[PDB]
Amino acid sequence: HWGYGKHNGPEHWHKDFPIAKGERQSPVDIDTHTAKYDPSLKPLSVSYDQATSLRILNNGHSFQVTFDDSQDKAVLKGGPLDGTYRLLQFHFHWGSLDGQGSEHTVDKKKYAAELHLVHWNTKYGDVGKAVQQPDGLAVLGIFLKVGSAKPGLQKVVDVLDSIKTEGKSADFTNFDPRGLLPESLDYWTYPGSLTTPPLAECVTWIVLKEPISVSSEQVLKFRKLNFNGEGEPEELMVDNWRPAQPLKNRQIKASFK
Numbered sequence: 421h422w423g424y425g426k427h428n429g430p431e432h433w434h435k436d437f438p439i440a441k442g443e444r445q446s447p448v449d450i451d452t453h454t455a456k457y458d459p460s461l462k463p464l465s466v467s468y469d470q471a472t473s474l475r476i477l478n479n480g481h482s483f484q485v486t487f488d489d490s491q492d493k494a495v496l497k498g499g500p501l502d503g504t505y506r507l508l509q510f511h512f513h514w515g516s517l518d519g520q521g522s523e524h525t526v527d528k529k530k531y532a533a534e535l536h537l538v539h540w541n542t543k544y545g546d547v548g549k550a551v552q553q554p555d556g557l558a559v560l561g562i563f564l565k566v567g568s569a570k571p572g573l574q575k576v577v578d579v580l581d582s583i584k585t586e587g588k589s590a591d592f593t594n595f596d597p598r599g600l601l602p603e604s605l606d607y608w609t610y611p612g613s614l615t616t617p618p619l620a621e622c623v624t625w626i627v628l629k630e631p632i633s634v635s636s637e638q639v640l641k642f643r644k645l646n647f648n649g650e651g652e653p654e655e656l657m658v659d660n661w662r663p664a665q666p667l668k669n670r671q672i673k674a675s676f677k
């Protein structure tokens with residue numbers, strides 16, 4: 421029922437999910453001059469060498485690549501985190517044009533798109549339990565700008581024609597998400613939420629300062645996806661981003677000076 425349109429979009433979500441107006445909602449604008457350098461923050465540990473991708477899916481709000489999270493094969497640790505977070509899936513948010521698409525903004529700057537790698541805390545045993553906990557999830561956010569192609573993204577772009585409409589899925593084995601990472605793991609971090617329903621306040625956000633560059637041809641392929649099911653009027657899958665929410669009583673911390 422919820423979506424990104426005039427009648428069902430982010431301004432409507434609070435009616436089915438009242439936590440939409442809560443104290444720790446995401447995304448937010450990252451004010452770079454107000455974010456505090458925290459020399460206590462550790463380097464982020466990204467261990468994706470044994471990642472096992474399974475499927476790529478159009479879920480009617482994005483597309484996601486899903487991983488085997490039944491063992492510690494692809495894990496996020498350190499940075500602001502206590503303990504071990506398993507990679508469940510990655511997905512993107514993007515715009516109708518290059519000047520919008522990111523969920524987080526930097527000094528009010530919007531990027532063409534934003535990549536989210538979703539991880540859950542192994543101390544809670546499964547992701548359904550983890551979303552009920554204030555430290556249940558860690559989402560690694562990476563900005564996309566349009567320029568040079570990202571070679572590591574091309575395998576994803578080339579299969580999108582096979583999952584054009586909602587619920588369509590395909591085999592997507594042996595995909596290496598290390599090919600989506602920028603050089604630097606310098607980050608901002610703050611306590612927040614899922615950015616779609618159910619908007620659960622379970623997320624430690626880790627947003628990388630360095631964007632990756634993707635080509636216009638790569639992002640054009642995102643914009644050919646459809647929100648609609650096969651045979652329905654349909655409706656290009658574009659502008660699937662929630663706008664920045666009030667920071668309220670929260671501090672954004674920087675890992676870097």
Ligand SMILES: C[C@]12CC[C@H]3[C@@H](CC=C4C[C@@H](OS(N)(=O)=O)CC[C@@]43C)[C@@H]1CC[C@@H]2C=O
Nearest residue numbers: 536538547548551559613614615616617618
């Ligand atoms: C599957 C669930 C509902 C959907 C939840 C998932 C946890 C995290 C994300 C990531 C989020 O996007 S974002 N932008 O916040 O990272 C989109 C929603 C989604 C897929 C839940 C785990 C349990 C729950 C129902 O069984």
Ligand SMILES: [Zn+2]
Nearest residue numbers: 511513536615
């Ligand atoms: Zn997301």
